[PDB]
Symmetry: D2
Subunit: 42 residues, 4 copies
């Protein structure tokens, strides 16, 4: 796949397990849009 350079990844400490699940959903949610954003124009 060789891949382009993916956006630099950063780690983040999140207090509260509940908050982590919430942040994960927002994280995965943005990643999902990004996968479709990677769709060619048209």
């Amino acid at each position: 796949k060789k891949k382009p350079l993916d956006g630099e990844y950063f780690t983040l400490q999140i207090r509260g397990r509940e908050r982590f699940e919430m942040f994960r959903e927002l994280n995965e949610a943005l990643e999902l849009k990004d996968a479709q954003a990677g769709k060619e124009p048209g």
Copy 2:
């Protein structure tokens, strides 16, 4: 300080440096409210 048990901390990989700054603001923003939430009733 001995401290109570703080909420279990979790790490999260965030793609995109811009997204990290954004997630950090939400993270710090929630932590700030939590510091005031730790305020005694009354």
Copy 3:
């Protein structure tokens, strides 16, 4: 389409136009996952 009952919609005032675009992305991002979550099991 008759539709099932969609989740009750709520309006929210967001200060700062920049914040609005940011909140909109998170909003649309969650809605996108929801559209795929509406996918039948399997």
Copy 4:
């Protein structure tokens, strides 16, 4: 108070009552930081 011009406010429709409470917390959380950000330097 006369006030400066506050950031232009924008309304946003949020599906799911649960999501609304979540978005409200992030909204209030950012507003709280903004109130302290309005603190003079020093």
